Amino acid sequence: ELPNYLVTLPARLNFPSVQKVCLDLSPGYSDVKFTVTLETKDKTQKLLEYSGLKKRHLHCISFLVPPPAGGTEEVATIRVSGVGNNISFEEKKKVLIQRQGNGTFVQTDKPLYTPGQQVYFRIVTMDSNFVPVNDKYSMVELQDPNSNRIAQWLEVVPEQGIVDLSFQLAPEAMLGTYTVAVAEGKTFGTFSVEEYVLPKFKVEVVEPKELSTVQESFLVKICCRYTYGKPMLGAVQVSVCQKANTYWYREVEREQLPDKCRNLSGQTDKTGCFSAPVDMATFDLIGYAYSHQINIVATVVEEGTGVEANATQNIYISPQMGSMTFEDTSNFYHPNFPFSGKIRVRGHDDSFLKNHLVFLVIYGTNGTFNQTLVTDNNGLAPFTLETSGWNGTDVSLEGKFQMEDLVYNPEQVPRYYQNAYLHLRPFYSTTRSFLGIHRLNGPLKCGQPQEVLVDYYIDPADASPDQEISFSYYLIGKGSLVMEGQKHLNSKKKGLKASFSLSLTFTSRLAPDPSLVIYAIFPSGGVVADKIQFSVEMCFDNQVSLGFSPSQQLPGAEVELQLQAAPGSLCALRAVDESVLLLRPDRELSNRSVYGMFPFWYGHYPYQVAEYDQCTDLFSFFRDVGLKILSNAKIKKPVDCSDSQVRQYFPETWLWDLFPIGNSGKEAVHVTVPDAITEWKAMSFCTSQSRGFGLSPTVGLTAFKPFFVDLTLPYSVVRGESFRLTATIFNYLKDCIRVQTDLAKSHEYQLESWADSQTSSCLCADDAKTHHWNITAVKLGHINFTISTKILDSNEPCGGQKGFVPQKGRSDTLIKPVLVKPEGVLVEKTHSSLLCPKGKVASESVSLELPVDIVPDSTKAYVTVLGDIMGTALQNLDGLVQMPSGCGEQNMVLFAPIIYVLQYLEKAGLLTEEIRSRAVGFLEIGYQKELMYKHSNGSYSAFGERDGNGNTWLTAFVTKCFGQAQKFIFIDPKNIQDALKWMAGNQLPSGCYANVGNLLHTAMKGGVDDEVSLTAYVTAALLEMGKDVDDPMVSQGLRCLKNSATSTTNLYTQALLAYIFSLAGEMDIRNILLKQLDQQAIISGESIYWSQAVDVELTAYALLAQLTKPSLTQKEIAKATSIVAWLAKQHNAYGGFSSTQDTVVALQALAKYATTAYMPSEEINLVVKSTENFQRTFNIQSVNRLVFQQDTLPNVPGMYTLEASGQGCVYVQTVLRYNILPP
Amino acid sequence: ELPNYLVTLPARLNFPSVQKVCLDLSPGYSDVKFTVTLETKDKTQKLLEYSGLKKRHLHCISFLVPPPAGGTEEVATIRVSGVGNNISFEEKKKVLIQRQGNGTFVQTDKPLYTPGQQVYFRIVTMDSNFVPVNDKYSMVELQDPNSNRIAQWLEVVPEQGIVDLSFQLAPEAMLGTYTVAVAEGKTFGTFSVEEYVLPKFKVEVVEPKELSTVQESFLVKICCRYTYGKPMLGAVQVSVCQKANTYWYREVEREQLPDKCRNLSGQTDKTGCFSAPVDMATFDLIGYAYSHQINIVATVVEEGTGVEANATQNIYISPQMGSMTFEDTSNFYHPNFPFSGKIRVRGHDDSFLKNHLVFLVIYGTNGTFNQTLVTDNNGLAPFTLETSGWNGTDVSLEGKFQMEDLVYNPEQVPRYYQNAYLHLRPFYSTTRSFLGIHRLNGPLKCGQPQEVLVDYYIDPADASPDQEISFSYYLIGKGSLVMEGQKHLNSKKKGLKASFSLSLTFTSRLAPDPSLVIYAIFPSGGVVADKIQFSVEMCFDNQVSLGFSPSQQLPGAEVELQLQAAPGSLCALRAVDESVLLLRPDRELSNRSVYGMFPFWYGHYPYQVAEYDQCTDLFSFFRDVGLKILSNAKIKKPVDCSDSQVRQYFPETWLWDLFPIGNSGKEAVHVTVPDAITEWKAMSFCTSQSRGFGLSPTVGLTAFKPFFVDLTLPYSVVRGESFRLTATIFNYLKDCIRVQTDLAKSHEYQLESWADSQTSSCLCADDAKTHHWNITAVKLGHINFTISTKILDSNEPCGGQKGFVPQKGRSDTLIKPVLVKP
Structure with missing residues (x-):
């Protein structure tokens, strides 16, 4: 036999984490010292030193990773070395250590x-x-x-x-x-x-949720429900409509058809939900001029009240009547062994279909196969296929509804069937043995041990009967090896279709889609392996659940609240109204958002340590889960190239308290329900360093009263008007009752009172009696409207029998605030000052007045102090130096702003040398990116070296970029003198812009894109580095421009031709057009700008025209301060990489304005003093510099003193808001 | 009738921790709103907004401690305020907030x-x-x-x-x-x-560990063992001696009698433990001039080598032969209800005595009462007493061996009986009821849920049968509330001696001595209570273990160390040699040391927030644990005065590493053993933010070889000066074999040719042979000394039989560095 080994590590290591590394040893060896190391640039850490055993042994150890030798990312080297007895096995791979995304x-x-x-x-x-x-x-x-x-x-x-x-x-x-x-x-x-009022009811569609083209009619069902769980009446208008489809061409046949629509008018039932059918004979599903989309606009008005709710539903009409997707199957088959899987069969209504005859057609090189199957009574279609005829060839499975497809018709849209497509690849099995894992249905739970059955067959042609067999299993969760093991099996059974079991436990460390990889290395050297994925629900470590008891309880008394979590946690709890989630949908804090902020749905090898063997197997099995494998076993395929209750309350957020969870795991708190009859949706996330993060599902406490009132009244109320105060009195008791209603009259609101002075009425079960008033107010601010109702004992019967009083909840009062504003139209008087003492005290007397036509308690005035030139996004200017490129003509406009931001940052006091070095390295590698656009004539071009002499704009832009970069890096000026002969040859002194050169991108050179602007820029590019007038090119440029200086017209071009004369330092002809420039500027308060994207460019050029010229005065200082204050809020002034030239010219305007007058504050103590000896002090040093501080002043508006002491410049803006009579 | 409340807080809050606070309320109220809140010098957080309920309810919440406004220590105030329906209850009490002690x-x-x-x-x-x-x-x-x-x-x-x-x-x-x-x-x-050489053997006493005066002659069983678990033969000289005690007056009679020493020479047996009886009448036990403390200095020398090991055993001689102590008993007693207790019975060796008639005597104002009790076969004396005739008066209990004490004699030291003395205080019980808690053995076990049985009697005269009576229990450890509960009983059971149970769990948050307090308030206004003190071993929440497999290895082969701690824990290691511990004893890293790192007096208020009267009940039950109580019930009494390998090795520590623990709670590593024939003592601790600190017992690996050699040589050698290098050969094989020895010659050192060659010899089972050489040094620095021994097959018999060659252990090569100084 031949001994083997297998070491496995995560490919993408994480720096504050603890990871695993596993090493599997064959029998044999048993005298070789194995050791594995990972080598960083700081140390060489041995992972495990080890020796072989008499049996197969899988040994896995946890380790703290080395820190990355770079800033946040480093390619470390994993090394296996087996030494001892004149053999040295050595294998060498690369892994990646990075600080992972700490999501917030x-x-x-x-x-x-x-x-x-x-x-x-x-x-x-x-x-x-x-x-x-x-x-x-x-x-x-x-x-x-x-x-x-x-x-x-x-x-x-x-x-x-x-x-x-x-x-x-x-x-x-x-x-x-x-x-x-x-x-x-x-x-x-x-x-x-914003300004809002709380709606008391939600309207929603119920039955229209899916529509198909094969239906005849669909029943619109509009359910309107209160927040406290009762239905209601009210007139319903439903607009059901299909709009005209906007075609992909937008220039021809643009005259469209009107939208096809039908309007429903009705009244809801006793269950409060209106139903009516709508045919699709109205809409055009066949026509392509109308979209496959139906908008449902449901509008419900409450009876006798006037308040209105709307639901805007979008329905996508689908001709697909059924979906068949593979969901529990493998992408690979073992040769000549059975292959198992199952098919999810669903209809158009995403429901599990019953008794469907599905047809599986198999495409292979031996022959097309067909097999029919019947779904069970749960919505699944299992299948096992015999692969022995597949001959080791990749095949294709297709599950269809029918053999014959629908013929495409002109009169009808062809209803497509979403078939079930799959491609099966043969697993690289060099030795005939089989593994398989039975998959575990849909989503799996967490915290309970899943019992998983594993089927196998070890053939007696490559494993001898004395050899013990063992299967090594890895559970991989979120790309890290999270569970490991090996099962030893008895060698006496050997060849049979046998099985065993594993007991797993999925958790939050396991992925939403984790993996199970099992394998077995034979002593012949071949390996037999199988992996499956898993469907795991978005679970969490802390089993948090939230509980209300008694979960539907009267407003104003206690409810017990249960927190279920892991012990030792600190847990945050939000109990909020339903009605504040009716206007704006909440920012989604759920399991999907917490799992979604870490972008790891792909797994896999990273770009840095990827193995490009190509010019499936076990190596691909570990590559798909994101694990580096080092082995000498046959794991690599050879490469192929191819009782009255007073009710004032807290109707907003109810609970925002923190609760540390004790050692019991559970923790209770009793909370008092606010008196607003709504539903309270509550949620909690608990966090702990012991277990982790856990998130409760949201629950609801329905605060409900049987008999109550509800005032409705708007929020935006002005004084003098008589607003509609509508009091809807609700009886939900089963017996008919008599109510007495009265508004408690106070001296803060006036009315002439339809049906006041303790009115009485009769109502019954599920009834809403709506009393009406119009009220005018006399005070200001928030004022209270209070109402009271009682259930009187019925002296006379009404509604049939005698009315019956309940024992509890007989009376109900209500106190509701409203905001009332002064009369007339509002108008603001603003005045700004730029107080800049230089190590001294600078003072200014501000005088702000008012016409005498003001209602009392209407004038307000407040002062704002700011220590910085712009509001936010200095780190945007830090991030502008990144992302180099060399494609297109956006490379020059992305390589322009580096010199401007490093000129800007050194005058702001926040300059850093590492971004200085990185930005000039990007600029030095950016000098080479304009070299392949060099023309053969000796100039630059937009695209290609044979297109022709280049345009004046791009040559002037690279002339400016080369001449302004000499302050940071070394740029040779020989290319400038090579360009100047083509500036002289392109434009004649007898006539400028002879039209040689064209830009690839249109609407790019400016807001007007005429010849005089390009001429003035290319003749203003010479003297803008610090030169004077000394050239024939600038002389013929001013000869061309002096005729247009007296011609006026197109103030953008007038401002940029005043720019070159401001560079010339002459005051003879730019002053006759300066007066018509600033007087045409519109006023937006103190953030004014010039008006004729184009206006922001005109503002930047006119700011540099007003700033570049000499003799700056204090009125010009305040005017330029107002201009750069308007440019402070422009997000298009900085932040564009492929944008226009507005960014660099506004940014160099900011650089020149930081150069000349406004330097940022580093120590300002400011004091304001009024007429009535009131004073206030601001401190602006380094970290509250950008804080835009306010102060409200209580004096009658007049003359005030504004004093700044210290070193720095500060900006003070005073705003007076007041209301004047309209006549 | 009259509603009652009770608020409980710990009296000493630590800033980085969370703390419980509890509120208990009678039936009644339901129209007032209780606020308990904790104000300090910068903020005031509302601990409980809480309206009353129609039953008795116990609600407890956990809160983060406010920061110290004084910087490290301040006096905050907790106040209770029941406001509503023109009812304004308002009480307040001061509490201390300090930063917790960072042990290191x-x-x-x-x-x-x-x-x-x-x-x-x-x-x-x-x-x-x-x-x-x-x-x-x-x-x-x-x-x-x-x-x-x-x-x-x-x-x-x-x-x-x-x-x-x-x-x-x-x-x-x-x-x-x-x-x-x-x-x-x-x-x-x-x-x-300092300079040292590693001792390969230790020596300790076995049988003399206690000396009582009633003995005649006592055995001295000295025993000397190698570090690898094998016995050794040698010459043992034991000096057992009684020193003359110096007098307390250090001014006169400086003439001192010579110390009563006895010198004993012996040779150890095949089991290597030398035993000899010593008549203890030689030592002067009667007179005050000789000390009551024997000292045993035993020096053992190995044969043919000259190395020696000494053991100093200082044994106090005591006239006490037994000890009665109360350990499972209450300092309080309820009037006219039975009282239970247990007595520990121990002898002169503090071992559990069998079948001893212990005598309980009761000193009260009604009459002195006697009772006899027979101990079980465990060492315990369980007794119960009736308190009906005690009439609510404080009594005393004394548990003795016999009634008559020993008469003092001039000729003999009066031997004392260590009796058990106790004083029992009457419980401040306004309403008649009984609540008793059954004790639990000696030291309890951590982690397992113990079951405690609690019995009660609710008298129907001071209770109503329609309303239920609920017992509130507090399991308190280390000055803070740990576990809480409220358990109800219906009063349809009426008056009987009923019982129920609690399922307690003891952890490291609970103390070595935690407390349990159980109480109830009747609607008459009275209170019934019982407090017991537990006994838990010094526990850790992180249960960590070490296992060597296969726990005894030949040198040169890997050993799997298994480390068992909580997941997400970082664990240390220390595999020291035993021979390192033989020279200098280790400073203690144990659970006693870690628990004694923190001050554990406890059980009382701090002096800055202490309360005192002018000159027992539930308020004393909470004072004796150290918890602040705000209540309006009858909780306070009225005030009164109170085959061939070469062995170069690691004589320093073997394992010193950091192994983090994965999610399975297990880690393992195959570590290679060093080439010394010794025992490695390994110990680990693990630190985790989840389950805290955990400390493991010191497990041991006996790295042993059956046939080997050792080199006795000093650390420091003067250059040009001759020393004696003594190489001993150990055979622990069961047969008799023949050895051959070659000492390697080199130019680093010079030899004087003392038994230069032909040192082949016969060694039988459990045997050692030492060969000496006269070696001098010639060059400075560290010098290797190499010896290679092997087993040769020969027809010449050793011990009458041919020496059988082994299959593993045929040879042994040892390399020892030595330091040479000029």
Whole structure:
């Protein structure tokens, strides 16, 4: 016999992890010292030293990995060496050690906020094995919808992997999509802040969920239900419609047909759900001018109330009436042994079909085979096939509904049958023996031992009867070898179709789709092996479950709450209203999102250590699961080339408390239900360094009362108007009752009161009596509307019999707040100052006034201080230096911004030398990327060296890029002088732009793309490095441009021709067009910009025209400060790699503005002082520099003093909002 | 009638841990809202918002401890407030918050080094819940014994709570007790460095371990064994001696009588244990001038070699021949209900005596009572007493051997009976009921769920049959609440001596001495309770074991070491030689040492939050464990005054590695044994954040060969000076064989030709033959000395028969380095 060995490691090692390495020894050897090492550049760690035994032995050891010798990634070398008695086996492979993606998320308690609320949020960072990581954050930031950073917490440490942070939102905070970022990661937790009111009912479709083209009619069923679980009445309008399909060509036959649609009007039943049938004779399933799509817009208005809900459902019409997919089968067959599998058969309605005659056709080189099968009464079709006629050839399985396909017809869409296709490859079995694993149905549970049966046959032609046989099994989860073992079997049985069993246990360390690989090496050297995948549900380490008792309980009294988790955990709990999830769907915190933030659905070898043998077997079996194998056994295929209750409450988020789980595993807390009659959806994620991360499914506590009231009233209420206060009184008791309703009159709202002063009415079971009022308000802010109802004892009978009072819940009151705003139209007066003392005190007196037409308590004024030139995304400027390229003409516009960002960063005080070196290395390898576009004439071209003389734009761009890169690296100026002779030859002094050269990409050279702009750029490119006017090229350029300077027109071109005269330093003709430039600029507050993508370019060129010119004054300083404040919020000003030239010109405008006037703050103490001797102090040093701080001032608006002391420049913006009478 | 509440907190909160808090409520309430909250000097978190229920309910929640506003230690306050329906209950009590003690130990691979070797050491931090912390180490330092810091490490980060560091000692490093110190703290580890040679055998006493005065003559059974488990023949000289005791007055009568020594010479038997009786009347037991403490110094010399091993056994001589101690009993007793207890019965050797009539006498105000009791065949005396006639008065119990004590005599030392004395206090019981907890044996077993039987009697005069009575139980360990429960019983059973059971689980969170408190509040206002103290062995939550397979190996063959700990744990190793432990005894790394690393007085409040009266009940039951109680029930009494291989090897440690544990909880490694004929003692500890710290027993591997050699030679050799190299040959084969010996000649050393060749000889079973040579050194430094022995087949009989050649063990080649100095 020949002894063998097999060592297996993960191919992709992870740095804070503990991994396994397995080594299997044949019998024989038994005198050879085996040792395995992994060699990094820092050490040589031996994994195991070992010797052979008299039997086959599989030995697996765990190890802490070496750190990577690079920054975060290093190719280490795995080495097996067997020494001893004049033989030295040595084999050598490469593995990869990298710091894996520590995935994080941020969970706000709500996706929605009124202004004045409190944004609570938890940031969780967690490992690939769902272990929490206490890698403490540098910074976390909360930014406006204007991308302006308004909150920042620095150097924050998490407890048990999670951190909670509370930001009190402003009562005057602007409406939009706020964002929260951590450490400048890939996670941007966004929440909306807007004005909203809570809907009390959800409308949804029920029966239209699938539609096929073979149906005749479908029954639209629209169910509207309250949040507390009761049905309701109300008028229903359902718009069922198919829109016209927009074709892939958008220029011809664009005059479309109108959308085909039918509108349903109705009333819901006693179960509160309206049903009506709609034919598909209305819609055009045959026609390609209409999409295969039906929009259902269901709109329900409550009876006598006026509130409205809508459901927007999208249905995709499918001509496919049945789906047949392989789901439990292998991609490989062993030769001349039976092959097993099963087919999932489903219909159009994704339901498990019954008693279907499926037909399996087999394509092979011997002959086409056909076999029919019948599904069972569960929806599966098992099959076993005899492969002995397949002759070791790759075959094809096709499961079909019928033998004959549908003939394509003009009058009807051909209904396609989704067949079951499979390709079977012969396994590389050099020795005749068989393994097979019986697969385990659908999704498998976790924490319980799965019993898996393994079938085998060891033939007595390659294994002698004295040789003990053993099967080595590996369970691989998420690309790491997570379970190992070997089973020894008795050698006396030898040749029979036998079986044995394994007892596995799937968990969160196991994948959603993990693998089982079993193998057996014979003493002949051949191996027989089989692997299967698995369907494992998205489980977790902590078995968390949430429990309410008694789970449907009256509003205002206690409910016991159970947390089930692993002991020693710290667990976070969110109990929130249903109604706040009715407007915006919540940010999905589930098992699928936690499993989805780690991108490892592929497994496999990485790019760094991949083995390209090609110019299936056991090596492919370990390659597909992501394990490096080193062996001398025949595992490689040879390569081939081819009782009154007062009710004020907490209707928003209810529970946001942290609970550490004790040693019992379970923990209870009694919580008091808020008085809003809704459903509370609660969820919890528990985390622990012991077991891991666990996530409860969300549960619901239905707070419900039998008899109650409900006020409805809008949120956006202005003063003076009479709004519709609608009070819907609900009786859900089974007996008819009498109610008495009264609004408690106070001195804070006015009405003339239809049916007030303790009105009385009669109602009965499932009844909603809607009283109406219109109310006008006199106060401001939040004011309370209070109502009370009682069930009177019936002196007279009504509704038939005498009314009956319940013993409990006889009375019900309600207090509801509303926000009332001042009258008139709003208008803002803003004033900005750039206070820059240089080691001193700089002061400014600000005066802001108001016309005398104001209603009282309407004027508000607040001041904002900012220490930085722009809001956020300095790390975007850090990331602009990456991603080199050499394809297309986007390479020059991606290699342009490096010199600009390293000019910008050194004047901001945050320059780093390692990105300096990396960026100039990228620029030095980027100098070679413009060399194969060099023309044969001695110039550059857009594409090819034979196209012709190049365009002036690209030659001027590479002239600027070569002349502005001499401050960082060595660029020779000989190519500039080689280009200048072709600038002189291309444009005549008698006439400029003789039209030689063309760009490959259109709408790219500018916003206008005319000849005078390209001429002014190529004649402005010479003197923009620091040169004066000394050349014939710039002389003929100014000769061409001085005629157009007096011609005016097209202010973009006027600004960029004022740019070259500002480079010339002359004030004679650019001042006669400067006055018509700034007066045509529109005003957007203090963030103004010039208006004629094109406007941002015009703003950048006019900022450099106003900045490059000499004699900068303070009004020009404030004007340019307003311009760069508008450019601060432009996300297209920086962040584009294949974008236009706007990015580099706005970025060099930022660089020149940091050069000349505004340098960033490093120590500013600011004080504001008012008329009424009120003062306030801001501190802006280095980390609250970007924090855009606010302060609300209580004085009557007048003259105020704004003083800045220290070293640095600061920006102060004062905003006065007030309301004026419309006449 | 009158509703009652009870709030329980630990009285000493540790900052990185979580703590329980408990609230128990009577039937009644259901309209008030109880808030318990813990305020400190920066924040106030609401521990429980909680409305009342119509039954009795026990609700307990776990909370994170607030940070210390004082920096490391502060006095917070917990308060209870029941507000609602114009009812305002408000009470408060002070509690202490301090940072928990970070324990730290350092181990080394050996406790003893020659200069020129590598010193390894591991330093481990530890919490009071035995979980390791990866706290940032500032600096660690290594000091010469002249108080000079010779090595220095700055800014070392722990990997899974431990640090593993190495240092190369100098080849001319001077001799003394070097010290490893951490951050100028209280932790230090001393290792001695001097020249040594490894002893191959040890010697200890077997039979003399206790001396009582009633003996006539006592056996001295000295016994000497090799490290590889085999007996040895030799010459034994034992000095058994009684020293003259120095007087307490150190000013007069300096003339001292000579020490009563007896010298015994002997040869060990085939089992290698020398036994000889010594008449103990030679030693002066009566007089005070001679000490009551014998000292046995035994020196054993191997024949033909000259090496010697000494053992010093210091045995106290005691006149005590027995001990009555109370160990399973309560300090309290309930009035007019039976009281149970158990007595340990031990003799002069502290062994369990059989069939001893122990006598219980009871000292009370009604009358002194006597009772006799027969022990079982285990060593226990279980008794029960009626307390109906005791009338609620504190009593005393005394358990004795006999009624009459021994008369003091001038001619004899008065031998004392160590009786069992106890004082029983009356329980403060306002309402008549009984609650007793049955005891559980001696030291309990960790991890297994024990079953405890608790019996009770609820008197129907002070209870109502319609309402149920629920017993609340607290299983408390190491000053914090561990396990909780509320177990109800219906009062339809009425008044009887009923019983029920609890399923307890004891872990490392629970103490070596944890407590169990069971109580109940009746609606009259009274309370009934019982507290017992358990006894658990010094346990760890991480159960770790080591196994060598096949646990006895010839040198040169691999051995599978199996290491069994929790998954996700990082484990140390130490496979030291036994011969290293024979020179310097190891500093103790055991469960006693780890549990004694932390102060374990406990059972009381801190002095900053202590409560005292002007001058037992449930409040004393919670004081004696150290828990704060806020209650309005009758919980306080009214105030009153109170074949051929060459053997070069590893005479240092064999295994010193870090093996993390995978998910199966098992690890294994085939480790190659070193080529010394010895025993390797291996021990490991594992640190995990999940299951904490775990420490394994010291398992042993006997690396043994049947036929081998050994070289006796000193460490230091003066160059140009002759020494005696003594090579001994051991035959442990069962037959008689013929050996042949060749000492390798080289230019590194010179020989004087003493039995140069033809040293072939006959060695029978369990035999040793020593050959001496006169060898001098010629060159400086380390010198190899090589000996090769083999078995030759010859027709010349050895012992009357031809020497049978082995199949394994035919030859043995040994290489020993030696140090040569000028």
